[PDB]
Swiss-Prot record:
InterPro entries: Malate_synth_C_sf, Malate_synth_sf, Malate_synthase_TIM, Malate_synthG, MS_C, MS_N, MS_N_TIM-barrel_dom, MSG_insertion. Glyoxylate binds at R325, E417, G442, F443, L444, D445. This is Malate synthase G. The gene is glcB. Belongs to the malate synthase family. GlcB subfamily. GO terms for molecular function: magnesium ion binding; malate synthase activity. The modification Cysteine sulfenic acid (-SOH) is found at A602. Its EC number is 2.3.3.9. Involved in the glycolate utilization. Catalyzes the condensation and subsequent hydrolysis of acetyl-coenzyme A (acetyl-CoA) and glyoxylate to form malate and CoA. It is found in: Cytoplasm. Keywords: Cytoplasm, Glyoxylate bypass, Magnesium, Metal-binding, Oxidation, Transferase, Tricarboxylic acid cycle. Gene3D superfamilies: Malate synthase, domain 3, Malate synthase, domain III. Monomer. The keyword Zinc-finger does not apply.
Amino acid sequence: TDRVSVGNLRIARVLYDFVNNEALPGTDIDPDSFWAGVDKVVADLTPQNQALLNARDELQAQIDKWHRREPIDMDAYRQFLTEIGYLLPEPDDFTITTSGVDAEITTTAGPQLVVPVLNARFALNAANARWGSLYDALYGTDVIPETDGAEKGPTYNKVRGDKVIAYARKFLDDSVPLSSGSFGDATGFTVQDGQLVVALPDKSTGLANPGQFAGYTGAAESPTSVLLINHGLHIEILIDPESQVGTTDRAGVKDVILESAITTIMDFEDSVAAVDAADKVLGYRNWLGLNKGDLAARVLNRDRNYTAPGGGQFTLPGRSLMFVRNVGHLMTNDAIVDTDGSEVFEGIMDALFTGLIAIHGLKASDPLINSRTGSIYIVKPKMHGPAEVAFTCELFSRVEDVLGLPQNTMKIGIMDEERRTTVNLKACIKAAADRVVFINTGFLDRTGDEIHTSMEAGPMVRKGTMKSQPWILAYEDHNVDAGLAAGFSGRAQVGKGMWTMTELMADMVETKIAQPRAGASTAWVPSPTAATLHALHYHQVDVAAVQQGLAGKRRATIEQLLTIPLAKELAWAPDEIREEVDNNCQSILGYVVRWVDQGVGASKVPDIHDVALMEDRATLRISSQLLANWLRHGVITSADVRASLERMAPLVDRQNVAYRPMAPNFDDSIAFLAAQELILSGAQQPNGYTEPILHRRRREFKARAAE
Ligand SMILES: O=C(O)/C(O)=C/C(=O)c1cccc(O)c1
Ligand SMILES: [Mg+2]
Ligand code: NI
């Protein structure tokens, strides 16, 4: 591969050209001194990046030996963990000082959307998911069940449409109540002397809380829409008797529009497959078009115009406020190598290049696309403990100097998704006291790190049992406590994890309310549709109140956090073990095959119960680590795993279209071998991470497809 020499670095030409021709134009940064900054940061910061990675292994190996050397004594285990410096002293109370953050993060509680940056349409829809149609969300999914009468089909079904309408009217009643009567019986809306007036058949009523009236469009005496607010989220009733739905409605309502994905995370990490310069350029380019505003497949929303209750004009943001998730400290990428052929740390690159690109979002498009307060929002995943957070800080300060940006311009969304972070979370937050804009429980990764850390102690409970183990319940509460106690209320997001069941929206609406009821001012959804249905929860839960009631609680002990999810003796019949194995192998195989063969890093994979699951590297990190733990402790044999992989593989072949089967020549299929390796090599991956194998096998496939 052809490279450009800058100092000690050899930069892949496609990446060199991309920065110079596309990313640097318009930033007033001088290209020669940008690259000089790249060279200088790489050389100054690569050693400690590597030292931190060595500390991980050195710590895991001590813990390994300790478990090998009989009901686990917690007091001894605490003190060993403290002594090897795993468990560090909790610092004294403090308050974060992160300033210049936008209202969508400091103040608004609402859904947060994660989307793979390499898919421009997905990324486009996600940036546009700030507003979404409630009707579409209910008509298109199973929130409205398809009992007799209400089935979707080729044409519009009015029995279903009616239930959609009745559902939305009750949401209005429950969110923006009338002084008397129900939106179900409304026949019209007008604005009289700056106040909302709803016409019932007998009388007429106003709002039980007139402050919930935020504006309108059209003439005040028969507006084209009425705009409400509740818990800081906007609700827009679209009024159009002319339209098909509008004609049938007792008040001519066409839709209820919900402000939904308040912020969106454009993902470079677990939900994309990017193994060289060609791949990273594609991601960087899409991130560039998002920040310049001209990304198009279909284009980015402009803000929305309203008339205030008094008759003046105002505007509301039409776009999700955009985070970008960089990769973490682990991997390297040959998009840059040095003189010796050593690859450059990929995370360092993401900070330089996603940060460079982000500057366009602070500046007028073609009107400022992203942060009006002047911040750049970078999620930093998969950090292990407070020193690794301080490293990320040091990297962002050095990249700011290279880019010419005020110090602390680059904010950090801290993932709490590694065990050494969990049990040191307070010190991890303090380590970023003036950059941190959220903490979030990345429970999937956190579950993979739970299995790997304690890989030597014994067999683990089944995957489906993890969700209710004491360590994770402690971890979710301990994350809220640490957030609230560092002054996150009004300052930074307290965020929880992802709903993976992409077609079970009835279930999501019924159960995911637990997250705001637990004091989380945001949580993760995988589609704009799911963002819309998840907004409902924030209208029913007063997260501000919930957080206020939780201040000063400390609800998890370090003992509970350290409670390893060991399986109790002989808990499983032959058929239950088989199901776990089979299921784990199916999901692994389904995800890996599109990863290695097509470069898709996030796939909907049905499971053994045919539930469609949105899989990314974290869910793969759980399934691979679990089977490696069962294999390590004799729960299954190597014959079982190879048998199960061979069994599930044709099933995966069948579920797939411009695609290459894995059966029957398993030993020919790079995708099959990668899958096999994740399991049989699983205990030897650093912290169970799946990237090392996925990258090598993706690069392996790319080379084969080119000969
Ligand atoms: O729990 C975590 O560790 C975490 O980071 C979650 C994800 O990245 C994610 C994104 C899309 C789909 C999915 O299933 C998971
Ligand atoms: Mg994660
Ligand atoms: Ni309320």
